[PDB]
């Protein structure tokens, strides 16, 4: 990662929390590291705007870089002219996080309720249970995001607190 140049500066400091307010983060470390990767791409993005048209460096190291941005699910395909790459911004990597995509797809009624649902052995995307909120969905995995076979809200067990609630009824009311 890299720290930004100025640590305390008014229009940027409040611009932190309006990112922390919508997305629901916990550390500006999880903001700065995202800008850090966007920093390294963007320097490379300006490199291929200097060289010649139809350079195979501008082809092979350009278009695959363009297609990888379509592959991560950020660059829409209409803007596929390598001139929207400068017009990228911070929230689009924040938008492709595994936490926020849960709330967009119904099912969470918050961005903070979905944060708790990541770390409790719930929702998987493929057959792998994901419990890191920054899993960065690749746009070919959206309509596989679903409740687990186990871990209720998905069924076949009601769980240790629902079974304990069942246990209380049998011992005092019943036997």
């Amino acid at each position: 990662y890299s720290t930004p140049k100025r640590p305390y500066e008014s229009s940027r400091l409040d611009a932190e929390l309006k990112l922390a307010g919508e997305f629901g983060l916990k550390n500006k470390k999880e903001i700065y590291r995202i800008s850090f990767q966007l920093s390294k791409i963007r320097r490379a993005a300006r490199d291929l705007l200097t060289r010649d048209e139809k350079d195979p460096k501008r082809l092979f190291e350009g278009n695959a870089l363009i297609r990888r941005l379509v592959r991560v699910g950020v660059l829409s395909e209409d803007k596929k002219k390598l001139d929207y790459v400068l017009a990228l911004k911070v929230e689009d990597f924040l938008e492709r996080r595994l936490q926020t995509q849960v709330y967009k797809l119904g099912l969470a009624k918050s961005v903070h309720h979905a944060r708790v649902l990541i770390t409790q052995r719930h929702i998987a995307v493929g057959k792998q249970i994901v419990n890191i909120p920054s899993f960065m969905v690749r746009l070919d995995s959206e309509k596989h995001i679903d409740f687990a076979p186990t871990s209720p809200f998905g069924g076949a067990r009601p769980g240790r607190v629902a079974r304990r609630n069942a246990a209380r009824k049998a011992e005092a009311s019943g036997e």
Binding site: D14, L17, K18, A20, G21, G24, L25, K26, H112, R115
Partner: peptide
Amino acid sequence: KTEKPKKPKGRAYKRLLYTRRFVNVTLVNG
């Protein structure tokens, strides 16, 4: 050592602050 802070830790402190910020913002712009 003091028993003074009771204020939450980590994520829950950032949620409350955002809500307060929005409330403050509604007034002055409106």
